Amino acid sequence: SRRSRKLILFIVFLALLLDNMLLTVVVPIIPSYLYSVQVGLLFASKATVQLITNPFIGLLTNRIGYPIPIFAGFCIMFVSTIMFAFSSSYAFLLIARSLQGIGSSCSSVAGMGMLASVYTDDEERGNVMGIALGGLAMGVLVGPPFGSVLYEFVGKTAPFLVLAALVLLDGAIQLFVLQPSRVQPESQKGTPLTTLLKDPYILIAAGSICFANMGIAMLEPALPIWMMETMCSRKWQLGVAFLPASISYLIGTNIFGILAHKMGRWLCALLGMIIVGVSILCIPFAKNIYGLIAPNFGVGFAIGMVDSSMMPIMGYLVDLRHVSVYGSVYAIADVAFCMGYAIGPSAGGAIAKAIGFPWLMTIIGIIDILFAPLCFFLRSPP
Numbered sequence: 074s075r076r077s078r079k080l081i082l083f084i085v086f087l088a089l090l091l092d093n094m095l096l097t098v099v100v101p102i103i104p105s106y107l108y109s110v111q112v113g114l115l116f117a118s119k120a121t122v123q124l125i126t127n128p129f130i131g132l133l134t135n136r137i138g139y140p141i142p143i144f145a146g147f148c149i150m151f152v153s154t155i156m157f158a159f160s161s162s163y164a165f166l167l168i169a170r171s172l173q174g175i176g177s178s179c180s181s182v183a184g185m186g187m188l189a190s191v192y193t194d195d196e197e198r199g200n201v202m203g204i205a206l207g208g209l210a211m212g213v214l215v216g217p218p219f220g221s222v223l224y225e226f227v228g229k230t231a232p233f234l235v236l237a238a239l240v241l242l243d244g245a246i247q248l249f250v251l252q253p254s255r256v257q258p259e260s261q262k263g264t265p266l267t268t269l270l271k272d273p274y275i276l277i278a279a280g281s282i283c284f285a286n287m288g289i290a291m292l293e294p295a296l297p298i299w300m301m302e303t304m305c306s307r308k309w310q311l312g313v314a315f316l317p318a319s320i321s322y323l324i325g326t327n328i329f330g331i332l333a334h335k336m337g338r339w340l341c342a343l344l345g346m347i348i349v350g351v352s353i354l355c356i357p358f359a360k361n362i363y364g365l366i367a368p369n370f371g372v373g374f375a376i377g378m379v380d381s382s383m384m385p386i387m388g389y390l391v392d393l394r395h396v397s398v399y400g401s402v403y404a405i406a407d408v409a410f411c412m413g414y415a416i417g418p419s420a421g422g423a424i425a426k427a428i429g430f431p432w433l434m435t436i437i438g439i440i441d442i443l444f445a446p447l448c449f450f451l452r453s454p455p
């Protein structure tokens with residue numbers, strides 16, 4: 074086809090898919106590699122490398138162009154996967170995590186920027202960013218079972234080998250299509266990152282996205298270390314308790330990518346934050362898994378609402394009241410994502426150890442509810 078416009082969507086979607094496959098299949102492999110706390114230190118290290126790397130990639134992607142960081146991300150992700158598979162020492166795990174963070178940052182930021190650049194009209198742009206961000210749910214949904222069956226059936230390194238084969242298969246395509254053999258700088262100079270961080274609307278959007286993803290990032294490690302404490306659940310229910318969140322996030326991200334602009338971006342974000350707050354408030358006093366599935370469904374659906382309805386609004390803001398570039402603003406969006414992901418596990422575990430887990434749920438819900446009215450300012454920015 075001519076320039077294969079939807080193929081950019083496909084490549085971004087599959088890049089996020091495989092990024093989350095790496096981000097999730099690592100969970101049961103970390104304790105096995107460590108034996109043959111510091112178990113969560115790898116996740117924090119990857120997220121911190123990600124955070125440090127996002128602004129530099131944001132400047133780089135309009136310094137030289139969009140396809141070069143995407144190809145570099147595919148190369149560094151393949152290298153990270155290979156090294157992770159052939160990893161024994163703890164420092165090997167750390168360097169694999171660092172390369173993983175570099176790849177995730179550059180791939181996500183460059184893909185979002187290129188997707189924003191190719192598609193300008195708000196309807197289709199919201200649609201395609203919702204479809205692409207559906208990969209963020211698809212990867213974590215298909216991660217655990219695929220990884221577990223390939224790990225426990227044929228070998229430990231076999232899932233990584235098959236994943237590397239898939240990554241190479243996707244790198245074979247979008248190489249001639251994107252033809253990144255030559256550098257192509259941007260038509261116009263972009264706004265500096267400093268002035269974007271002085272813009273109240275961009276800051277409000279980044280903060281709301283950060284708090285929304287922060288809720289899930291806090292819930293991810295704290296829930297398994299809580300059901301064993303009070304309902305004394307077995308290991309069979311550990312994955313099932315967090316399972317519905319992925320389905321809810323996928324459904325919300327896929328459908329409100331078209332429903333959001335029809336209904337209203339600011340109102341959708343406010344409703345999503347309110348639903349996050351009430352659902353997280355509902356989680357702790359529930360006692361059985363039957364009473365825990367529904368609030369998890371709600372929180373996943375509302376996170377999908379916020380993300381799918383408020384990822385394209387950053388591009389909308391920078392297009393309406395700034396220079397028409399998206400690399401830096403999507404870099405700060407990914408900074409919000411992964412600063413939440415960084416201070417999620419470790420800080421959440423620390424505050425749960427110091428103060429009761431129901432108090433943690435209540436305080437996160439209170440913060441979400443209190444910050445939710447601040448999304449009203451996005452109704453009509455000057």
Ligand SMILES: NCCc1c[nH]c2ccc(O)cc12
Nearest residue numbers: 213286289318319322373376
């Ligand atoms: N935007 C990602 C937030 C989120 C919602 N549900 C999730 C499940 C797994 C995960 O890694 C992340 C999430």
